[PDB]
């Protein structure tokens, strides 16, 4: 049983780290895109 | 003005796609979190 619960914790923790890395990269890309979107929208509002 | 409008529209569309992928991602990651919970205390109690 100890080995079983250890294995489950190991695999689920590494999967969690992978998914969290995915979430962090997606969030950083989205934050960059949002900054660019807001700056370009301000430029458009300026331009008109 | 026209060019920046089109660029902002494309950026917003890409943001929405990334946001939906993000949606499925944190739902699945929360499921993996609750699975990965309840076994850490199990390993601790088992080895105690």
- Helix B40-47, helix A2-47: angle, nearest 10: 150
How far is it, in rounded angstroms, from Cα A41 to Cα B6? 11
Residue A13: CB partners within 8 Å, gap ≥ 6? B36
Contact at CB, A30 and B18, closer than 8 angstroms? yes
Enumerate long-range contacts of A1-10, CB under 8 Å, 24 or more apart. Answer: A1/B46, A2/B43, A2/B46, A2/B47, A5/B39, A5/B42, A5/B43, A5/B46, A6/B43, A8/B39, A9/B36, A9/B39, A9/B40, A9/B42, A9/B43
Resolution (Å units): 8.8
**Looking at the complex, does the CB of residue A7 fall below 8 Å from at least one CB of chain B?**
no
**Looking at the complex, does the CB of residue B18 fall below 8 Å from at least one CB of chain A?**
yes
Q: What is the experimental method?
A: cryo-EM
Question: B residues 19-48 near A, CB within 8 Å?
Answer: 19, 21-22, 25-26, 28-29, 32-33, 35-36, 39-40, 42-43, 46-47
How far is it, in rounded angstroms, from Cα A20 to Cα A23? 5
First to last CA, chain B: 68
């Amino acid at each position: 049983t100890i080995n079983q619960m250890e294995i489950s914790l190991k695999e689920e923790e590494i999967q969690l780290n992978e998914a969290t890395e995915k979430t962090n990269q997606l969030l950083a890309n989205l934050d960059k895109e949002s900054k660019k979107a807001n700056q370009k929208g301000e430029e458009v509002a300026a331009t008109n | 003005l026209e060019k920046a409008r089109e660029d902002l529209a494309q950026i917003q569309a890409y943001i929405k796609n990334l946001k939906d992928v993000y949606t499925k991602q944190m739902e699945e990651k929360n499921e993996l979190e609750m699975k990965a919970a309840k076994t850490k205390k199990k390993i601790n109690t088992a080895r105690t």
